[PDB]
Amino acid sequence: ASKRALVILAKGAEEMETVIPVDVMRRAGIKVTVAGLAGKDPVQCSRDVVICPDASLEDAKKEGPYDVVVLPGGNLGAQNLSESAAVKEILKEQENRKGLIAAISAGPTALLAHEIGFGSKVTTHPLAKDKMMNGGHYTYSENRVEKDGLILTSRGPGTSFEFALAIVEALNGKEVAAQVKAPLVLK
């Protein structure tokens, strides 16, 4: 049975960190829902790429649960994720059901805002470290991808393929991840 991913897309998201995981997960046969935080309307990303979500977050929530909830980064997108009561509820539920949560660059700082996964090892974008580490609630890692159980984090646009393939491996296994990787022409 196909695994399912919820990608939460907010204004100011890093569009590479949104599209690379969506695309790679779809390549892996994951059913991905790109859900707009603000509603069904197009989303203006950090570098002005405009992406049309598959559904509003409100609607996508009623179609869960999901095998992974994915938080792209970009500072302004991550702040919108961090400010959202809807995101808080989705992440709390996901953590309560022992489901994977994956966040990249500034995205992990929404985990802090929502009090998710304290006591985990995490990475972030280097520039987001101090924000993430306020209070000492996580242990910091400089690995390009960090996975501490059900909290999977990564650093930036240039780690997005590694992030996405780590999600694929966690859901669908190593062999699927390797099969998906080869046609991408990664170094």
Q: Are 113 and 129 in contact (CB under 8 A)?
A: no
Token look-up 């700082």 returns 109
Neighbours of 113 (CB within 10 A): 18
Confirm if 118 and 90 have CB atoms less than 8 A apart.
Answer: no
Q: Which is nearer to its own copies, 120 or 159 (CB)?
A: 159
Subset of residues 37 to 56 that bind its own copies, contact rule: CB under 8 A: 42, 46-52
Under rule CB under 5 A, residue 75 binds Cl ion: yes
User: Whole-number minimum distance, CB 186 to its own copies, in Å?
Assistant: 4
Residue 19 interacts with its own copies (CB under 8 A)? yes
User: To the nearest whole angstrom, how small is the minimum distance from the Cβ of residue 167 to its own copies?
Assistant: 15
Count of residues of this chain found to bind its own copies when the rule CB under 8 A is applied: 33
Q: Look up residue 64 and give its two tokens.
A: 């869960």
Identify residues 145-174 at the interface with its own copies (CB under 8 A). 155-159, 161
SS3 state at 165: helix
Picked from its own copies, Cl ion, none, the partner binding residue 74 (CB below 5 to 8 A depending on kind) is Cl ion
**Based on CB atoms, which residue is closest to its own copies, 120 or 154?**
154
Residue (of 123, 129, 172) closest to 151 by Cα position: 123
Q: How far is CA 7 from CA 57, 131, 182, in A?
A: 9, 22, 24
- Answer yes or no whether residue 109 interacts with Cl ion by CB under 5 A: no
Q: Does 80 bind Cl ion (CB under 5 A)?
A: no
Residue 76 touches its own copies, criterion: CB under 8 A: no
Q: Does 178 bind its own copies (CB under 8 A)?
A: no
Distance separating alpha carbons of residues 26 and 45, to the nearest angstrom:
21
Kindly determine how many residues on this chain lie close enough to bind Cl ion according to the rule CB under 5 A: 2
- Which partner from the list its own copies, Cl ion, none does 151 bind, CB cut-off 5 to 8 Å by kind? none
Q: Which two tokens stand for residue 153?
A: 């984090």
Of residues 99, 132, 158, 160, the one with CA closest to residue 141? 132
Task: Name the residues that contact its own copies, by CB under 8 A.
Answer: 14-16, 19-20, 22-23, 26-27, 34, 42, 46-52, 125-127, 144, 155-159, 161, 183-187
